[model samples]
Target: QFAKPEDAVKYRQSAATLMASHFGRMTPVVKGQAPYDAAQIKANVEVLKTLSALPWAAFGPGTEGGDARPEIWSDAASFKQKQQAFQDNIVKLSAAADAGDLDKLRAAFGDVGASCKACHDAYRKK
Candidate 1:
């Protein structure tokens, strides 16, 4: 329960940071300029992987730090699936990056983007 204003701010900050980072990295893929430093891709993938599980905690009921969106918690299973798809595809992309394979990396990038967009189309506000 988010009894304090700080609680909302803290969770919101965490959510925004993770979301923005992932979105920021996606631009390189969209621009066809991926296959980055192997180590860096690996590290970035790890961060994204962790964030993939964080979910739209905005889903949690009660007096929590959220915009009180019902669909997030209501359609929790689908959200988890979308998150998993994105994480899996991101992992694949990281693997391609580590191998320095641009072709595979591009494919994975598109797939990951699809996963991201799927959730955004459904849950995120434009």
Candidate 2:
């Protein structure tokens, strides 16, 4: 879909940057360093879901660079599994946010971070 591999790389990198910003912004609230404003956190999570979905399309074949490892292409299934785990937890996170329960949000937030960490450890270069 991209005109060139570089374009794909840019697209995914942009998405990833946005995802990180949105996800990281909630860290304080999740950590109890900042008060949990349920409405605010809920809105942020919704933005995260959109940002999270954008990068995958750019990760398809013929588009590989950035911090990505070749294993993303060679070990496709495992990568997909990690992506699924991350996405699923985002769903859980949304529900947690919707419930307006800090405890639930904390649990789901940690799961989402774990999923992201797992994928990064395996597929991204330091």
Candidate 3:
């Protein structure tokens, strides 16, 4: 466990950053704008699974020098729903990636993107 809220916040941010970059790569590659790498897609799924296990929502009460909007900790129901959807999509994407089907991976990746956008629209501050 983290020794303090600040530590938890930093850990969450670090993981989020890593996840963002991984997905960023996946998107362009999926769109045919970048090189395709099956191994990278597989590794991205692993990263998503790892992030899904972290108690990101339960940690730290506020932004506390973080970018998360207040609604993340305030409108808890919506946050939980979005989080579940995100995780579900990630699991689906993982399986899709394992199948090594580009079409399926693209579709599943779209679902994952939707979940991420839902949370970002409601809970992430620009």
Candidate 4:
């Protein structure tokens, strides 16, 4: 659907923004703190499944203007490794949600948070 590179960037930008919002909702629940919203966490995990599956290469050559640093392309292998780890943690989070166990969910959530921070620390521009 995105015929132009700019169009794809816009699309990606919107998705990224929404993902960030979902993460905000998940944070407290994941930490086993107040406002525990298991349903919300589950919903976010479902969205993340799709978002996480998106290939980094989908950004295509010459796509630019986002916080994603140049190392995402230049240091492709490390980026892919971290991306995969993030996606894998999302899968774990979904499974924990399905189990309906708060302890498991909290642990899985920590892994997911770590995965996200790892990627952001390495790939996102500071």
Cα RMSD (Å) per model? 3.6, 0.9, 2.3, 2.4
Best by lDDT: 2
Model 1, span 77-121: residue lDDT tens: 876777677777867867776676656756777787788778778
Arrange candidates by lDDT, descending.
2, 3, 4, 1
**What are the Cα lDDT values of the candidates?**
0.65, 0.90, 0.77, 0.74
The candidate that achieves the highest TM-score relative to the unseen native structure? 2
TM-score of 2: 0.96
Model 3 scores a TM of 0.82
Which ten residues in a row are the worst by lDDT in model 3?
A: 55-64
State which candidate, 1 or 3, has the greater TM-score. 3
- Candidate 1 Cα deviation (angstroms), residue 82: 2.1
- Model 1: how large is the Cα RMSD against the reference? 3.6
What C-alpha root-mean-square deviation, in Å, does candidate 2 show against the real structure?
Answer: 0.9
Instruction: Give the C-alpha lDDT of model 1.
Output: 0.65
Candidate 4 residue spans exceeding 4 A from truth? 31-40, 55-57
Question: How do the candidates rank by TM-score, highest first?
Answer: 2, 3, 4, 1
lDDT of 3 by residue, 33-123 (tens): 9877787778778877787657465355653556777677788777888888899898899998887778888999899888878888888
